[PDB]
Design an enzyme around this catalytic site. Structure first.
Site, PDB file in Angstrom:
ATOM      1  N   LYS A   1      -8.384  -2.195   7.210  1.00  0.00           N
ATOM      2  CA  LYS A   1      -7.269  -3.119   7.072  1.00  0.00           C
ATOM      3  C   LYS A   1      -5.998  -2.287   7.049  1.00  0.00           C
ATOM      4  CE  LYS A   1      -6.097  -5.126   3.099  1.00  0.00           C
ATOM      5  NZ  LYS A   1      -4.645  -4.805   3.062  1.00  0.00           N
TER       6      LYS A   1
ATOM      7  N   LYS B   1       0.258 -10.737   6.374  1.00  0.00           N
ATOM      8  CA  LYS B   1       0.579 -11.895   5.533  1.00  0.00           C
ATOM      9  C   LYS B   1       1.641 -12.761   6.175  1.00  0.00           C
ATOM     10  CE  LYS B   1      -1.285 -10.048   1.340  1.00  0.00           C
ATOM     11  NZ  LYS B   1      -1.603  -8.726   1.977  1.00  0.00           N
TER      12      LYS B   1
ATOM     13  N   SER C   1      -4.547 -12.128  -5.541  1.00  0.00           N
ATOM     14  CA  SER C   1      -5.190 -11.469  -6.675  1.00  0.00           C
ATOM     15  C   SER C   1      -4.282 -11.036  -7.828  1.00  0.00           C
ATOM     16  CB  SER C   1      -5.964 -10.240  -6.195  1.00  0.00           C
ATOM     17  OG  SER C   1      -5.064  -9.280  -5.657  1.00  0.00           O
TER      18      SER C   1
ATOM     19  N   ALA D   1      -9.006  -0.867  -8.323  1.00  0.00           N
ATOM     20  CA  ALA D   1      -7.738  -0.700  -9.013  1.00  0.00           C
ATOM     21  C   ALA D   1      -7.304  -1.943  -9.788  1.00  0.00           C
ATOM     22  CB  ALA D   1      -6.659  -0.295  -8.024  1.00  0.00           C
TER      23      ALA D   1
ATOM     24  N   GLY E   1     -11.419  -5.953 -10.066  1.00  0.00           N
ATOM     25  CA  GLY E   1     -12.540  -6.684  -9.516  1.00  0.00           C
ATOM     26  C   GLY E   1     -13.777  -5.814  -9.415  1.00  0.00           C
TER      27      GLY E   1
END
Ligand SMILES: O=c1cc(O)n([C@@H]2O[C@H](COP(=O)(O)O)[C@@H](O)[C@H]2O)c(=O)[nH]1
Ligand SMILES: O=c1cc(O)n([C@@H]2O[C@H](COP(=O)(O)O)[C@@H](O)[C@H]2O)c(=O)[nH]1
EC number: 4.1.1.23
Lengths: 218, 220
Positions: A34, A64, A119, A176, A179
């Protein structure tokens, strides 16, 4: 989309040398990277072609996209011209803006990922309350690829419920941001991991460790 | 205490070809000293395009990047954008206060400005953004945001946004021309109007800009 080891590298280093070196170090563990604006704005869109040349990985452009339909179409065209296989789009700006992206992706043989819920803590203010409806909008539009948050597994599970088992779901916030890799893969097809790998003392060891922890899900 | 936008008119330079973008911007430079550069041009020609505009025209540059990521990534995007020479960056408010703060912090450290986008001009904005817009604007005010973007095509919404942010805040407004917004009506509430296609797709962009300015002459 077949993501090796269910692990997507978020390459957010802003230096070409470091980004290429670290990616090279973990290349045996991934086949999907990504690439976002931190790297693209620092080193140029030519970085995408360079990654394909060096690594033969698939490239998800995490841009985004969040503009009006006219501008969204231009952004998608420029992005796919640079060699991205897929692009991530915000759902919050509504259906026409998403459809603009879907149109260009169809024209150029690429995929759109719809970002539902995010998130970070700020996601609770406006995005979270709209997220289920954004996901339903995705279903209505025929979106097959989605992004949802690793840090809120109950929200990620709900997103999976809405889109069904046939849709493809990837999830950032692993490492980080707190999760858990294994828990996230209960619901997502693949996890996105950035700093836990690329800021690690030994990035290859970090990647290997994450994969070891999910060995039975592979 | 706000940027001094010549003729209250900001060019949205969304041409994707370097030669055309430079030519058109050059043609309108006597009328406009502030240019909004977005991703269509930047993704096509690179961040160095900002340098090229500064070198050729000496115009102010607003980077319309609609920043909409987590705080960590927002910081990196702002840093890269300001490093390249942008005077200001436009940031989405819908991702919430921490994401906006991240941008404000970088802008403060680097001596540049943040513009907060609160409602958008396209039809899709009615689905989710419109319902959140008043609160996003209020959040901006609470965070100390001084510069805002709001839509020309919904005068009632633009007026409410102006109320929320107060008269001292700086407000710029797209959707004029191609999307149907009226220059004069929009300047009742906005400090400056943003215009793209109705200038840069004109046979004579200079004449198009001059014509818009003539139409708002009494407001300058
Ligand atoms: O909700 C979201 C959506 C994202 O794309 N991301 C992206 O995923 C990556 C997460 O990186 P990290 O593993 O270092 O936290 C970043 O590139 C970020 O922009 C996120 O963190 N949360
Ligand atoms: O709500 C908004 C926010 C924008 O930044 N914009 C931007 O303003 C410009 C409008 O251009 P135009 O005058 O050609 O319609 C585009 O760059 C677009 O991305 C908008 O149209 N509506």
């Amino acid at each position: 989309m077949d993501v090796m080891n269910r692990l997507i590298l978020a390459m957010d280093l802003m230096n070409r040398d470091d980004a290429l070196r670290v990616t090279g170090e973990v290349r045996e563990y991934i086949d999907t990277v990504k690439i976002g604006y931190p790297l693209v704005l620092s080193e140029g869109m030519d970085i995408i072609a360079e990654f394909r040349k060096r690594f033969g990985c698939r490239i998800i452009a995490d841009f985004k996209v969040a503009d009006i339909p006219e501008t969204n179409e231009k952004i998608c065209r420029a992005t796919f011209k640079a060699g991205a296989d897929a692009i991530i789009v915000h759902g919050f700006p509504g259906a026409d803006s998403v459809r603009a992206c879907l149109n260009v992706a169809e024209e150029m043989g690429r995929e759109v990922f719809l970002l539902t819920e995010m998130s970070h803590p700020g996601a609770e203010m406006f995005i979270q309350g709209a997220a289920d409806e954004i996901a339903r909008m995705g279903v209505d539009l025929g979106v097959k690829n989605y992004v949802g948050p690793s840090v809120r597994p109950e929200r990620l599970s709900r997103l999976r419920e809405i889109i069904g088992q046939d849709s493809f779901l990837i999830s950032p916030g692993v490492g980080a941001q707190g999760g858990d890799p294994g828990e996230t893969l209960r619901f997502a097809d693949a996890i996105i991991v950035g700093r836990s790998i690329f800021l690690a003392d030994n990035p290859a060891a970090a990647a290997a460790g994450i994969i070891e922890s999910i060995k039975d899900l592979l």
